Amino acid sequence: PVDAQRLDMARRRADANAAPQPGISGRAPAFVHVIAFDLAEPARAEPAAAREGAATALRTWAEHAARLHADGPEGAASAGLLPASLMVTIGIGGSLLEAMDAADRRPDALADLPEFATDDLRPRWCGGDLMLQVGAEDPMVLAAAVDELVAATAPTTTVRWSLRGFRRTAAAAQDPDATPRNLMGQIDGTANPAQDHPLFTRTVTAPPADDPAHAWMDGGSYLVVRRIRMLLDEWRRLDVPDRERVIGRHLDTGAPLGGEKETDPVVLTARDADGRLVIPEDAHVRLANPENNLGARMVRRGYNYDEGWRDDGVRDAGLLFMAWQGNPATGFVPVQRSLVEQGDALNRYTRHEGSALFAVPAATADRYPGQDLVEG
Amino acid sequence: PVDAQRLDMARRRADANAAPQPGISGRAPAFVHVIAFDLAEPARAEPAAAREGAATALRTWAEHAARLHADGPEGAASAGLLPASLMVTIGIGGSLLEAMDAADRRPDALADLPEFATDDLRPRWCGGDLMLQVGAEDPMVLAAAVDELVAATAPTTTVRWSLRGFRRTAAAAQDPDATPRNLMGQIDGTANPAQDHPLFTRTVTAPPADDPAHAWMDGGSYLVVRRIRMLLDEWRRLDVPDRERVIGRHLDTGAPLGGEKETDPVVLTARDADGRLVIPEDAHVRLANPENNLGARMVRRGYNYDEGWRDDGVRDAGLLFMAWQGNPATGFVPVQRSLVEQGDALNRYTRHEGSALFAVPAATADRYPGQDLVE
Numbered sequence: 182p183v184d185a186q187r188l189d190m191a192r193r194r195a196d197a198n199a200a201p202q203p204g205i206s207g208r209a210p211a212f213v214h215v216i217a218f219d220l221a222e223p224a225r226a227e228p229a230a231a232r233e234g235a236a237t238a239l240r241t242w243a244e245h246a247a248r249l250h251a252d253g254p255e256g257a258a259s260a261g262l263l264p265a266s267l268m269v270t271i272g273i274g275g276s277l278l279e280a281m282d283a284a285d286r287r288p289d290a291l292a293d294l295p296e297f298a299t300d301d302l303r304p305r306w307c308g309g310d311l312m313l314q315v316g317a318e319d320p321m322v323l324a325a326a327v328d329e330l331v332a333a334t335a336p337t338t339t340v341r342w343s344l345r346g347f348r349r350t351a352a353a354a355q356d357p358d359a360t361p362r363n364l365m366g367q368i369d370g371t372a373n374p375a376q377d378h379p380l381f382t383r384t385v386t387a388p389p390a391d392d393p394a395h396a397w398m399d400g401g402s403y404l405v406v407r408r409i410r411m412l413l414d415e416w417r418r419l420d421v422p423d424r425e426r427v428i429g430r431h432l433d434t435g436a437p438l439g440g441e442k443e444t445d446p447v448v449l450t451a452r453d454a455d456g457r458l459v460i461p462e463d464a465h466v467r468l469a470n471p472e473n474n475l476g477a478r479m480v481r482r483g484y485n486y487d488e489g490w491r492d493d494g495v496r497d498a499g500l501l502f503m504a505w506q507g508n509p510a511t512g513f514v515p516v517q518r519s520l521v522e523q524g525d526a527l528n529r530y531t532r533h534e535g536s537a538l539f540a541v542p543a544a545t546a547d548r549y550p551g552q553d554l555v556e557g
Numbered sequence: 558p559v560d561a562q563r564l565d566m567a568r569r570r571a572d573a574n575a576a577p578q579p580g581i582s583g584r585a586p587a588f589v590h591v592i593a594f595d596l597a598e599p600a601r602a603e604p605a606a607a608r609e610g611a612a613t614a615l616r617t618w619a620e621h622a623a624r625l626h627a628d629g630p631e632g633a634a635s636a637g638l639l640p641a642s643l644m645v646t647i648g649i650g651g652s653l654l655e656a657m658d659a660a661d662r663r664p665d666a667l668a669d670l671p672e673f674a675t676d677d678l679r680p681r682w683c684g685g686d687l688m689l690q691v692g693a694e695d696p697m698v699l700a701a702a703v704d705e706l707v708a709a710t711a712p713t714t715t716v717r718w719s720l721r722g723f724r725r726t727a728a729a730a731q732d733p734d735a736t737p738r739n740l741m742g743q744i745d746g747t748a749n750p751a752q753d754h755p756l757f758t759r760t761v762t763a764p765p766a767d768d769p770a771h772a773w774m775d776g777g778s779y780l781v782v783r784r785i786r787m788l789l790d791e792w793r794r795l796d797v798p799d800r801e802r803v804i805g806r807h808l809d810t811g812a813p814l815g816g817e818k819e820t821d822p823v824v825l826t827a828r829d830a831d832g833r834l835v836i837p838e839d840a841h842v843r844l845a846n847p848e849n850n851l852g853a854r855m856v857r858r859g860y861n862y863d864e865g866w867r868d869d870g871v872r873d874a875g876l877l878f879m880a881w882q883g884n885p886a887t888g889f890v891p892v893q894r895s896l897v898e899q900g901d902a903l904n905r906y907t908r909h910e911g912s913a914l915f916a917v918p919a920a921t922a923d924r925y926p927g928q929d930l931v932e
């Protein structure tokens with residue numbers, strides 16, 4: 182009975198009608214490949230050519246996504262494989278609008294992210310004119326889809342940066358409904374709004390614009406990507422109770438400190454007999470709580486990444502962090518401000534090395550994502 | 558019915574007693590992480606310290622391997638996961654013996670690989686004193702096991718290079734028993750000797766040494782690893798028939814050209830009505846055939862890798878090639894010489910960018926791999 186649950190993600194097709202696009206709601210597949218692209222020159226250097234280039238890329242990816250969602254990848258590489266929940270998300274960067282001389286079409290929510298004091302960003306791992314998020318429950322299905330999509334729009338597009346990520350597969354999960362863990366061992370995702378709830382929808386969806394020139398993003402979502410390296414050598418030096426105090430939750434059960442189940446509320450007022458706070462003043466979940474951030478909320482849909490070791494022998498692995506929200510100004514941005522400015526204990530164990538913001542529009546029946554922008 | 562088949566690799570434990578070590582025979586898990594290590598510099602520049610460091614690393618990995626095989630990874634990262642066929646292989650490079658001032662313990666089979674004319678090797682991605690091959694049907698189980706093993710022997714060891722690879726998962730396979738494909742779309746593994754038969758064992762197993770100094774490798778196997786980049790952009794320009802001519806087999810069925818089924822024997826004498834060879838004179842499978850190589854053969858147990866795009870724009874993806882044999886001189890080496898010297902049609906679509914040779918000793922009772930050598 183759990184056996185069908187364990188096979189379900191590999192067996193089924195994704196819901197291609199998921200809003201605003203696939204890759205946000207629903208069960209997340211075990212594998213992801215996030216790819217940021219720039220428009221190639223000299224098309225990018227002339228606004229009319231850039232608009233034409235954007236149209237070409239966005240339409241082409243939308244056409245292939247339709248076929249991939251319905252039939253899977255074309256190649257022999259994916260022959261004999263099940264659909265594996267293959268899903269394609271298409272996004273647009275603020276710099277695309279700049280290249281098209283279309284700053285008047287740029288919603289306030291697409292403003293560049295602030296610099297933060299803890300940033301350790303590599304410029305070539307940041308930003309991008311365009312984005313594909315490709316996901317699947319199988320890495321061969323995924324690689325075939327990725328190669329197809331990237332080759333389809335060459336040479337009008339060029340890859341700027343990309344990163345592959347994973348979670349545990351449903352097939353190897355004792356409970357395929359359990360929330361996934363990250364490479365620090367932590368259950369990661371608990372506080373996300375439930376998939377049922379209207380709260381999920383309110384959290385990820387952009388409210389209608391007051392300016393009609395910005396309305397192409399009505400019903401869309403914004404994605405903030407952060408490539409966050411984990412300092413696992415330093416992390417391993419900590420005993421379990423200290424690791425738990427960095428976050429504010431138990432490692433084994435995922436329960437808040439002071440609680441007993443993963444789903445128990447995080448009680449931030451709880452004190453010991455001697456007056457000490459049970460969850461420390463610098464605990465991650467204390468500083469990230471919506472109540473500490475003017476009500477700010479997001480859906481975190483991240484993946485683990487493992488890129489081995491760098492030339493100095495330091496581990497290059499971490500969290501491919503992905504936050505979805507209707508407006509970064511009331512989602513990622515204030516929360517990240519709190520983590521940085523209020524001294525999140527997790528700061529000392531992490532390094533943000535890549536970053537991007539993308540607008541992910543909703544497209545009607547017979548249109549491609551961004552068609553309202555490019556043809557408007 | 559096939560449902561249980563699809564779940565089996567994720568559900569089961571690996572056979573910890575597989576010979577000479579796990580990771581060579583048996584069903585291969587969907588994920589691999591190959592890690593090459595060097596002794597750290599305190600340990601390495603003095604033979605007495607190097608011998609101590611080698612014993613420490615090999616014993617520790619063996620102890621952890623036993624626990625991993627039995628109960629899975631310790632860490633919370635793999636909590637709530639099934640065993641996923643987790644398996645650990647431990648290997649030794651010739652350079653370890655040099656560091657230990659034990660060069661005369663190196664069997665002939667551990668001699669450095671030749672340079673080949675097509676080599677495009679980056680030094681940072683070649684060699685190593687020591688090797689771990691860690692495999693599992695799940696990437697989270699794999700990553701937890703890897704983090705445990707690498708941490709266990711730090712700082713006596715340091716990572717020199719590593720590469721992660723994948724195959725299709727059993728869970729997503731229409732037929733979990735079908736042979737896996739590579740990123741060029743080709744069925745890959747067909748001509749490997751069958752596992753339940755004498756030829757497989759003769760092919761992978763080092764025969765007993767003439768001299769006690771080399772007996773530590775009796776019954777072991779040798780791994781040749783090659784990181785082979787595929788020129789996939791160039792490959793895509795070819796139509797299907799021309800792709801098939803590069804290899805000598807059909808893409809859809811995996812049959813030899815001229816045949817109907819994957820398992821049909823290759824007919825290297827066949828010609829068409831024009832007098833044209835059915836399998837091209839430079840087809841990969843023609844040049845790689847044991848009878849073009851005085852009987853040389855090997856067991857190929859490779860994985861696909863995907864490392865995105867380099868700064869120069871090139872797609873960094875391909876085949877993590879892994880050949881197992883009792884002696885590289887009667888396996889990988891003479892075959893590679895043929896592919897290079899006779900102009901394999903596949904050469905122009907591939908670049909060998911990393912390479913290593915490791916000795917993988919036979920496991921015994923309550924000893925660790927290499928204990929015969931280090932003690």
Ligand code: HEM
Nearest residue numbers: 367368369370371372409466469470471500513516517531
């Ligand atoms: C490698 C870096 C990070 C790690 C390991 C991490 C880990 C965690 C963990 C274990 C939890 C508790 C379980 C849960 O509710 O999901 C959590 C909660 C949370 N994190 Fe992070 N996180 C990281 C980065 C970030 C960043 C950059 C942000 C936003 C800017 C963020 C925002 C949040 C939020 C909003 C919660 C839920 C708070 C609540 O309402 O209880 N996290 N994180």
Ligand code: HEM
Nearest residue numbers: 743744745746747748785842845846847876889892893907
């Ligand atoms: C990216 C590089 C390579 C690719 C894509 C590739 C692919 C293939 C394919 C598709 C086959 C036919 C199916 C099979 O029998 O497995 C094959 C056969 C074979 N390959 Fe390769 N190969 C590569 C590199 C090598 C290298 C470097 C060697 C040895 C030095 C090698 C040795 C062999 C052998 C011995 C066979 C079986 C020949 C026979 O007895 O029929 N391959 N390879």
